[PDB]
Homo-oligomer: 31 residues x 6
Amino acid sequence: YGGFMTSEKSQTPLVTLFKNAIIKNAYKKGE
Amino acid sequence: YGGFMTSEKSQTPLVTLFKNAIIKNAYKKGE
Amino acid sequence: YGGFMTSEKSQTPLVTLFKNAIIKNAYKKGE
Amino acid sequence: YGGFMTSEKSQTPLVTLFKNAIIKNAYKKGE
Amino acid sequence: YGGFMTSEKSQTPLVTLFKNAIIKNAYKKGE
Amino acid sequence: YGGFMTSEKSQTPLVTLFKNAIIKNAYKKGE
């Protein structure tokens, strides 16, 4: 878990197309 | 879980098209 | 779960078109 | 679940058109 | 967990397409 | 955990395609 949640369910060789991915403090102090 | 929830159910090689993805404090202190 | 809920049910290679995705405190302290 | 609920039921390669998606405290403390 | 969450479930040799990946304080002090 | 989370579940010789990977303070003081 964290930031963008990419949940892809498939019984085949898929691929996660992530472009311009910017993580700005995805996780805070407490969590 | 977290940020954008991408739930894709398919028995084929799909792909998550994520553009301009910006995570701003997706997770707070407590969670 | 979290932020935008993308529930796509299909027996084919689909794709999640997410543009200008901005996560602003998607998850609070408690949750 | 969370934020915008996108429930699309189809036996074909669809696509979730999400533009200007802004998650502002989609999840509160309790939940 | 951390930053962008890439959850890909498939019984085949897939691949994570991560471009322009930028981690800006993915993890805060507390976490 | 840390920075970009690449979770790929497959019973085959896959590969993580990471391009333009930039880690900017992936881990803060506390963590």
